[PDB]
Ligand binder design. Sequence first.
Ligand code: CU1
Ligand code: CU1
Ligand code: K
Ligand code: K
Ligand code: K
Ligand code: K
Ligand code: K
Ligand code: K
Ligand code: K
Ligand code: K
Ligand code: K
Ligand code: K
Ligand code: K
Ligand code: K
Ligand code: K
Ligand code: K
Ligand code: K
Ligand code: K
Ligand code: K
Ligand code: K
Ligand code: K
Ligand code: K
Ligand code: K
Ligand code: K
Ligand code: K
Ligand code: K
Ligand code: K
Ligand code: K
Ligand code: K
Ligand code: K
Ligand code: K
Ligand code: K
Ligand code: K
Ligand code: MG
Ligand code: MG
Ligand code: MG
Ligand code: MG
Ligand code: MG
Ligand code: MG
Ligand code: MG
Ligand code: MG
Ligand code: MG
Ligand code: MG
Ligand code: MG
Ligand code: MG
Ligand code: MG
Ligand code: MG
Ligand code: MG
Ligand code: MG
Ligand code: MG
Ligand code: MG
Ligand code: MG
Ligand code: MG
Ligand code: MG
Ligand code: MG
Ligand code: MG
Ligand code: MG
Ligand code: MG
Ligand code: MG
Ligand code: MG
Ligand code: MG
Ligand code: MG
Ligand code: MG
Ligand code: MG
Ligand code: MG
Ligand code: MG
Ligand code: MG
Ligand code: MG
Ligand code: MG
Ligand code: MG
Ligand code: MG
Ligand code: MG
Ligand code: MG
Ligand code: MG
Ligand code: MG
Ligand code: MG
Ligand code: MG
Ligand code: MG
Ligand code: MG
Ligand code: MG
Ligand code: MG
Ligand code: MG
Ligand code: MG
Ligand code: MG
Ligand code: MG
Ligand code: MG
Ligand code: MG
Ligand code: MG
Ligand code: MG
Ligand code: MG
Ligand code: MG
Ligand code: MG
Ligand code: MG
Ligand code: MG
Ligand code: MG
Ligand code: MG
Ligand code: MG
Ligand code: MG
Ligand code: MG
Ligand code: MG
Ligand code: MG
Ligand code: MG
Lengths: 93, 77, 46, 103, 62
Amino acid sequence: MIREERLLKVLRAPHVSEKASTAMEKSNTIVLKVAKDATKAEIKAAVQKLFEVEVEVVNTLVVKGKVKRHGQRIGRRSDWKKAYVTLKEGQNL
Amino acid sequence: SRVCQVTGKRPVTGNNRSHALNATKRRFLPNLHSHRFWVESEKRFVTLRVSAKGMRVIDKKGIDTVLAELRARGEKY
Amino acid sequence: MKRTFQPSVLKRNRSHGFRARMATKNGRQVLARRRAKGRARLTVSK
Amino acid sequence: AAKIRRDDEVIVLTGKDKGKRGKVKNVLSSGKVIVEGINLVKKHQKPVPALNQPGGIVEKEAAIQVSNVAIFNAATGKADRVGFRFEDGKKVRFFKSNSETIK
Amino acid sequence: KAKELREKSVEELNTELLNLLREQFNLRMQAASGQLQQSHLLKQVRRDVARVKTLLNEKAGA
RNA sequence: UGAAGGUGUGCUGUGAGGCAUGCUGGAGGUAUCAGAAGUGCGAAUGCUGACAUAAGUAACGAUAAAGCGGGUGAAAAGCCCGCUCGCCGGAAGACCAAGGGUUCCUGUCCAACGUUAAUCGGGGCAGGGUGAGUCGACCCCUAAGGCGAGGCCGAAAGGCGUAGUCGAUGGGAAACAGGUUAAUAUUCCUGUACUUGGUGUUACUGCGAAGGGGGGACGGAGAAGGCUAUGUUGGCCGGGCG
RNA sequence: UAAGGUGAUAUGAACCGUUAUAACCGGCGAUUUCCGAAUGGGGAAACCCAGUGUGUUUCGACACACUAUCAUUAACUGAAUCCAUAGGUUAAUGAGGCGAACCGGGGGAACUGAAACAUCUAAGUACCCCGAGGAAAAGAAAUCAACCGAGAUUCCCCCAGUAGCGGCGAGCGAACGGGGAGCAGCCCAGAGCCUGAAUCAGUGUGUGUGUUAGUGGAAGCGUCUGGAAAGGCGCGCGAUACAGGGUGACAGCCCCGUACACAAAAAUGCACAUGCUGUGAGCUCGAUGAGUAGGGCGGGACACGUGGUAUCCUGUCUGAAUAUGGGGGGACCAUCCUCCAAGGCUAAAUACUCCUGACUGACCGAUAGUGAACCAGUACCGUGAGGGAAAGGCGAAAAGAACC
Ligand SMILES: [Cu+]
Ligand SMILES: [Cu+]
Ligand SMILES: [K+]
Ligand SMILES: [K+]
Ligand SMILES: [K+]
Ligand SMILES: [K+]
Ligand SMILES: [K+]
Ligand SMILES: [K+]
Ligand SMILES: [K+]
Ligand SMILES: [K+]
Ligand SMILES: [K+]
Ligand SMILES: [K+]
Ligand SMILES: [K+]
Ligand SMILES: [K+]
Ligand SMILES: [K+]
Ligand SMILES: [K+]
Ligand SMILES: [K+]
Ligand SMILES: [K+]
Ligand SMILES: [K+]
Ligand SMILES: [K+]
Ligand SMILES: [K+]
Ligand SMILES: [K+]
Ligand SMILES: [K+]
Ligand SMILES: [K+]
Ligand SMILES: [K+]
Ligand SMILES: [K+]
Ligand SMILES: [K+]
Ligand SMILES: [K+]
Ligand SMILES: [K+]
Ligand SMILES: [K+]
Ligand SMILES: [K+]
Ligand SMILES: [K+]
Ligand SMILES: [K+]
Ligand SMILES: [Mg+2]
Ligand SMILES: [Mg+2]
Ligand SMILES: [Mg+2]
Ligand SMILES: [Mg+2]
Ligand SMILES: [Mg+2]
Ligand SMILES: [Mg+2]
Ligand SMILES: [Mg+2]
Ligand SMILES: [Mg+2]
Ligand SMILES: [Mg+2]
Ligand SMILES: [Mg+2]
Ligand SMILES: [Mg+2]
Ligand SMILES: [Mg+2]
Ligand SMILES: [Mg+2]
Ligand SMILES: [Mg+2]
Ligand SMILES: [Mg+2]
Ligand SMILES: [Mg+2]
Ligand SMILES: [Mg+2]
Ligand SMILES: [Mg+2]
Ligand SMILES: [Mg+2]
Ligand SMILES: [Mg+2]
Ligand SMILES: [Mg+2]
Ligand SMILES: [Mg+2]
Ligand SMILES: [Mg+2]
Ligand SMILES: [Mg+2]
Ligand SMILES: [Mg+2]
Ligand SMILES: [Mg+2]
Ligand SMILES: [Mg+2]
Ligand SMILES: [Mg+2]
Ligand SMILES: [Mg+2]
Ligand SMILES: [Mg+2]
Ligand SMILES: [Mg+2]
Ligand SMILES: [Mg+2]
Ligand SMILES: [Mg+2]
Ligand SMILES: [Mg+2]
Ligand SMILES: [Mg+2]
Ligand SMILES: [Mg+2]
Ligand SMILES: [Mg+2]
Ligand SMILES: [Mg+2]
Ligand SMILES: [Mg+2]
Ligand SMILES: [Mg+2]
Ligand SMILES: [Mg+2]
Ligand SMILES: [Mg+2]
Ligand SMILES: [Mg+2]
Ligand SMILES: [Mg+2]
Ligand SMILES: [Mg+2]
Ligand SMILES: [Mg+2]
Ligand SMILES: [Mg+2]
Ligand SMILES: [Mg+2]
Ligand SMILES: [Mg+2]
Ligand SMILES: [Mg+2]
Ligand SMILES: [Mg+2]
Ligand SMILES: [Mg+2]
Ligand SMILES: [Mg+2]
Ligand SMILES: [Mg+2]
Ligand SMILES: [Mg+2]
Ligand SMILES: [Mg+2]
Ligand SMILES: [Mg+2]
Ligand SMILES: [Mg+2]
Ligand SMILES: [Mg+2]
Ligand SMILES: [Mg+2]
Ligand SMILES: [Mg+2]
Ligand SMILES: [Mg+2]
Ligand SMILES: [Mg+2]
Ligand SMILES: [Mg+2]
Ligand SMILES: [Mg+2]
Ligand SMILES: [Mg+2]
Ligand SMILES: [Mg+2]
Ligand SMILES: [Mg+2]
Ligand SMILES: [Mg+2]
């Protein structure tokens, strides 16, 4: 049992993009920004508990942050974790 | 290390001098020997690495006194 | 023509990395020196 | 504590607006005050298409050094100086000239 | 709010902490989707969570 | 009611110099008599910065090569589309490891970068993009070698090394074809598979290792045979009649 | 403590607060990821992989806590080997790593000078290593002196570039004695009496006195020039405050301060006082540091280079007397004088400054002063150790140039 307090911290935001929208309307898969240290099992439990939908499978990847310039200053955005969450057929989010 | 367990004698440095008095660094080493000492009060032999001077010290003072000194100093044997 | 720098990350880390520096007293004195100088990058360790 | 506070009526001691009176609208941590209608400047405001675009020459108050204004003593009709004292266990300001408690 | 929280028991504090965490998650979702106009609520709930955890630590004798 | 500094002019002393003043400047300067020195520059193939000269000279980086029509645009030899021409093709094609690290795709911009122009770019800016039980790493296992509890040795620092523990470039389970994105795919989708382990039933039953044995497990060269990848031709199917 | 606030670039957005849970300042607390001595094992730092025990579970799993090494002590256990010992397990306590200098110790150059160079010098310097403390070391005469006396150690000024040492070259260079700073003496090598008596160390408790936020803090107007007055001119006022900084040009009286006078819920330094714990105080009788002193051989240290060379240390070989005795007084002997080694503790006067506060300068003022006034040990260079820049100024105020 993953504690609800942990489940409430692992989902960070929906991910909005053309690929995400196509995933939702073609494969019943929603795309999320998730905490960097979240596992697939944690993501699955959090989606099921908080969004109240049944999940088929979770795929994950780590996005490396870009180096950016700002007023001659060089910086680097943080890496983050993206989750493609496939829902069971018939579920709607 | 080349150190006497009884006296603490150890290598010291100094010079070799030639007839023209050229000095070249050298060491003086202790005359160390590993020796099995019969401890009557414990019915056994204890091996110590000791200088010949230390062997004379044991002759004079008795192996029991010397071993008590070693235990007091923390030197294991 | 083949030049002198032929990079390998494994060799870089084994030769000059943080744990190699920590393995000897002379390497910990490199680190002490670079800290006293205030280097932003103490070692090659990436 | 500050001798000049927001809502105070002050008179300008120095500058192009010497002798003018107004009400303190803003006290800035840099030691400056915005005083109603006093230190006016003409800003050439560019139009901003994001919100509405009233791009034009706008008259607006600019901050003035707080040591360049004085509290105005309405009883005497003159600039005054502020002192502090404790009455009923609370710190209050008073006019130096007539020793009367402010507000 | 520390005074009013200090009157509650440990179980009430745990319930309040869980409620604050759910509120923080909902606020996070709204802010991410752009449906949140009162951004100050995020800091408010974060500091409330800190208050509750501090009081739980105080009551645990830590 | 205009300091220092800058730039001119006049006067002045034997000189280093001094005085006055117009303009510029816009806040400092300092007599006298004493006091102290980072107190005076043309040279040191002196040091730093700035700027000349040669000179609008040499060169623009493989002699594989271009021509034209249309588009866009302020502008087109160089970008986009088309037709033609030429060049590589055991590569100048395709795909990895290593190394690099966003260079990838889309929109937008042309200051600087690009040895020319640039509407173009590996350039600027913004957004997007990397989906795995089976691929790889991690992991089990060791080689050379490293470290190394005790230990042995050494003025100190340290050196060597036992039990061990690390260390791949080597040994160790399992996924294929088709489809799909602007950009990922043996990872997503469709279809069809496979491997290892934990639990729980059923049936039968001697299980048990840090120990024993087997196996893993191994060279160079050479010679054939049997094959497949693959190609060629026929047949077949569709199209053609120049 | 407060009428304002949510650090900077840096506007904006959404907000908080105005009489006291806004913000801000100080004391005490809470939280405090990962790497790093790094300590559960490993490792290419910031990662990979566990074991054990408590719980929890929706049977998928989850949370927490322990688990390094060495040293010492204790318990249990336990070989060859009968007693034992070695060995093994567990527990408690401690240690390790970092830091600019100063300090003690273990090792220890060369360039150079000698107008070459080897003795000698540079120099017990540089550097490497070990260890400590707020200081360290040293320290209560087996010391000097000179027949008179002094009286532990340390530091300063003389003595004196003297006496000496020295290929008597280059160079090296005291002491005695004198003036100062500071001053302090004790314990074991042992029993009896008398007893718990000084003295320190630790822990509470109070009183002062600081430190860590803070509070009050005097007195100026008119007029001229000017973009602006604090400047000119005129007339006033404060001063235990005319230190300093700011404000549109130069301000005792505009602002912040300054002299002066006050302030602490909480923590903490110091000095006293007073409790509790350990320690023993005084008298008598004793005892008085042996492989040591001394010697032979080889070195080293002493200003002193073996010299006629005392004295100190000891690698090697030896070896007393022990108070009726022994050490020293610069070869050595006699005499006399003086001290009592071979056990130990000890404040102050002394050394230094990574760091904190205040104040100061005939110190610098952007090629200067730190390498660095500025996002600098950065950019950049190098496999790496390491090397290492350039770059400050609109205005009083952004009023930073609407519109054509
Ligand atoms: Cu040794
Ligand atoms: Cu340790
Ligand atoms: K190497
Ligand atoms: K002249
Ligand atoms: K002139
Ligand atoms: K001038
Ligand atoms: K002068
Ligand atoms: K020159
Ligand atoms: K030219
Ligand atoms: K030309
Ligand atoms: K080029
Ligand atoms: K061109
Ligand atoms: K582009
Ligand atoms: K090996
Ligand atoms: K090995
Ligand atoms: K199974
Ligand atoms: K063979
Ligand atoms: K055919
Ligand atoms: K034809
Ligand atoms: K660790
Ligand atoms: K020499
Ligand atoms: K010479
Ligand atoms: K020579
Ligand atoms: K000479
Ligand atoms: K001298
Ligand atoms: K005036
Ligand atoms: K003012
Ligand atoms: K002033
Ligand atoms: K001598
Ligand atoms: K001797
Ligand atoms: K005598
Ligand atoms: K430098
Ligand atoms: K510099
Ligand atoms: Mg993956
Ligand atoms: Mg970051
Ligand atoms: Mg020498
Ligand atoms: Mg290679
Ligand atoms: Mg000047
Ligand atoms: Mg000047
Ligand atoms: Mg002069
Ligand atoms: Mg000069
Ligand atoms: Mg010049
Ligand atoms: Mg000259
Ligand atoms: Mg030249
Ligand atoms: Mg040139
Ligand atoms: Mg020519
Ligand atoms: Mg020509
Ligand atoms: Mg040409
Ligand atoms: Mg060429
Ligand atoms: Mg070309
Ligand atoms: Mg064309
Ligand atoms: Mg071309
Ligand atoms: Mg073309
Ligand atoms: Mg880029
Ligand atoms: Mg591209
Ligand atoms: Mg160009
Ligand atoms: Mg152009
Ligand atoms: Mg680009
Ligand atoms: Mg899948
Ligand atoms: Mg595989
Ligand atoms: Mg080893
Ligand atoms: Mg060891
Ligand atoms: Mg292994
Ligand atoms: Mg391999
Ligand atoms: Mg591709
Ligand atoms: Mg086997
Ligand atoms: Mg093999
Ligand atoms: Mg073969
Ligand atoms: Mg075939
Ligand atoms: Mg086939
Ligand atoms: Mg470790
Ligand atoms: Mg631990
Ligand atoms: Mg660990
Ligand atoms: Mg392991
Ligand atoms: Mg037995
Ligand atoms: Mg230490
Ligand atoms: Mg010479
Ligand atoms: Mg000397
Ligand atoms: Mg200390
Ligand atoms: Mg001491
Ligand atoms: Mg001592
Ligand atoms: Mg006498
Ligand atoms: Mg004499
Ligand atoms: Mg005050
Ligand atoms: Mg005042
Ligand atoms: Mg005027
Ligand atoms: Mg005035
Ligand atoms: Mg001015
Ligand atoms: Mg001024
Ligand atoms: Mg004695
Ligand atoms: Mg002797
Ligand atoms: Mg002798
Ligand atoms: Mg001798
Ligand atoms: Mg000698
Ligand atoms: Mg003697
Ligand atoms: Mg004598
Ligand atoms: Mg003498
Ligand atoms: Mg002695
Ligand atoms: Mg001091
Ligand atoms: Mg200081
Ligand atoms: Mg400089
Ligand atoms: Mg300048």
